Amino acid sequence: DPANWECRYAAFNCFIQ
Amino acid sequence: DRSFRWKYHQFRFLCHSNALPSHVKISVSRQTLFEDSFQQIMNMKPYDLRRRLYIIMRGEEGLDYGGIAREWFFLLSHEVLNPMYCLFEYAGKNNYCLQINPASSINPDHLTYFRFIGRFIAMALYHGKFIDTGFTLPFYKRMLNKRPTLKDLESIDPEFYNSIVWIKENNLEECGLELYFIQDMEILGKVTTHELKEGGESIRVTEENKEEYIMLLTDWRFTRGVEEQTKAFLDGFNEVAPLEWLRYFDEKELELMLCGMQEIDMSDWQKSTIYRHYTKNSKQIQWFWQVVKEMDNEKRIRLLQFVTGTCRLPVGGFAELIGSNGPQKFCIDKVGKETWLPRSHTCFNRLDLPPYKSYEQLREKLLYAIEETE
Ligand SMILES: *CC(=O)Nc1ccc(NC(=O)C*)cc1
CATH class of the missing domain: 3.90.1750.10 (Hect, E3 ligase catalytic domains)
Incomplete structure (x- = not known):
């Protein structure tokens, strides 16, 4: 299940930046 | 702002x-x-x-x-x-x-x-x-x-919501229903009755105190128990x-x-989408799907919240989308007249998209309701 929450930190960070 | x-x-x-x-x-x-x-x-x-x-x-x-x-x-x-x-x-x-x-x-x-x-x-x-x-x-x-609205009831309790629709849009004096300013509540087999207003144990709901009774019952459903x-x-x-x-x-x-956010694979979203009163080739939807391409994934996932009620997909993708009755795929339909906005029903994952005039109209009015309405 790391791929679950890890994909959500990555997408969120790319929007902000 | x-x-x-x-x-x-x-x-x-x-x-x-x-x-x-x-x-x-x-x-x-x-x-x-x-x-x-x-x-x-x-x-x-x-x-x-x-x-x-x-x-x-x-x-x-x-x-x-x-x-x-x-x-x-x-x-x-x-x-x-x-x-x-x-x-x-x-x-x-x-x-x-x-x-x-x-x-x-x-x-x-x-x-x-x-x-x-x-x-x-x-x-x-x-x-x-x-x-x-x-x-x-x-x-x-x-x-x-923020005070929960009538729209929020359709998201968490559509059957409770349909009862308030029926009350608001029907002269309940003809249909003959005794309603009072009270509500029962069964918690652990213990049934209790809450008074919506002062002395509502005795007050009928009529055409006059109806809209009031509607502001009360909605607030009780979001706070009871x-x-x-x-x-x-x-x-x-x-x-x-x-x-x-x-x-x-x-x-x-x-x-x-x-x-957080996910990147929303809409090669998946597009193929797992059904429709009323529309075809996959209606120039409305051919516009809608092209709008959502130019979106970044900010507003893409905001469109998900507007239609489905949340920003989280299920593990199975858009094919395993669930509503208030079970599995319910993403749906768009011909609902609303030309001078409307996109309204939604999250319990059905339905997007009431009125048949718009132009892509300029539909890219303009969609993002507003997505960003300024609920
Ligand atoms: C979360 C997901 O499904 N996909 C995804 C796409 C892009 C990114 N990163 C950036 O957009 C910068 C992470 C995850």
């Missing part, structure tokens, strides 16, 4: 400029997680939880402490839903609509667990970590002190992170701050 990036950047400054130095130590096991976290966090002080999370995963080899942080917040956000604690229930099948269990009092210390969850959610917002408990948008509205437990959650949350820090957010932005 401003964008989500500014709201995010301002909230990050508040947590940065109000953080205590050093770290907290929290040690847990795979099997003890909920009840090690309950003991250590509820024994620390509210302001202490504001210092760096130094999570100890007993049994593992602690290297990357940001990943164990992301891991601990996610795994615990699912361990609070354990039926053994009786804290939460679902208003539908397949885990649709997470709401507080009104029978949580069967857990004698339940208010202490809800104060624990309030702290745990505040720690996630304070530390930029994400959860996946699955709180509904009306739940976030209560954190923002959960007054205790909601107060415990907000009190524990306010201890760690002040609730005023969320004053600029809306309910959809607050879910983003707590759940």
Whole structure:
């Protein structure tokens, strides 16, 4: 299940930046 | 009024400029997680939880402490839903609509667990970590002190919502229904009746006090049997992170701050979409699908919140999309007249898209209702 929450930190960070 | 990036950047400054130095130590096991976290966090002080999370995963080899942080917040956000604690229930099948269990009092210390969850959610917002408990948008509205509306009823209780539609749009004097300003409530086999207004035990609902009776019944449905437990959650949350820090957010932005985003594969979204009164080749939908391509994934996932009620997909993709009756795919239809806006029904994952005149009209009026309506 790391791929679950890890994909959500990555997408969120790319929007902000 | 401003964008989500500014709201995010301002909230990050508040947590940065109000953080205590050093770290907290929290040690847990795979099997003890909920009840090690309950003991250590509820024994620390509210302001202490504001210092760096130094999570100890007993049994593992602690290297990357940001990943164990992301891991601990996610795994615990699912361990609070354990039926053994009786804290939460679902208003539908397949885990649709997470709401507080009104029978949580069967857990004698339940208010202490809800104060624990309030702290745990505040720690996630304070530390930029994400959860996946699955709180509904009306739940976030209560954190923002927004009053739940009639539209929110269709999201959490469509059958209760249809009863209020029927009351509002029908002369109930013809149809012959005795209604009074009261409401029953069965919690643990104990049936109790709440008075909506002063002396409503005796007052009929007529054509005159109807619209009032509608403002009352809606507010009761969002508070009944959960007054205790909601107060415990907000009190524990306010201890760690002040609730005023969320004053600029809306309910959809607050879910983003707590759940994060995914890139929404719409090669999947497009093929898992059904329609009323439209074909896949109607120039309306050929416009709609091209709009959502030019969207960034900010507003793509905001469109998901507007139509489905949340920003989180199921693990099966858009094919395993669930409504208030079970599996329910994404749907668009011909509903609304030319000078309308996109309205939605989250219980059916339905987008009431009126047949617009031009792509210029439809890119313009869609994003407004997505960004300014609910
Ligand atoms: C989360 C997901 O499904 N996909 C995804 C797409 C892009 C990114 N990163 C950026 O956009 C910068 C992460 C995850």
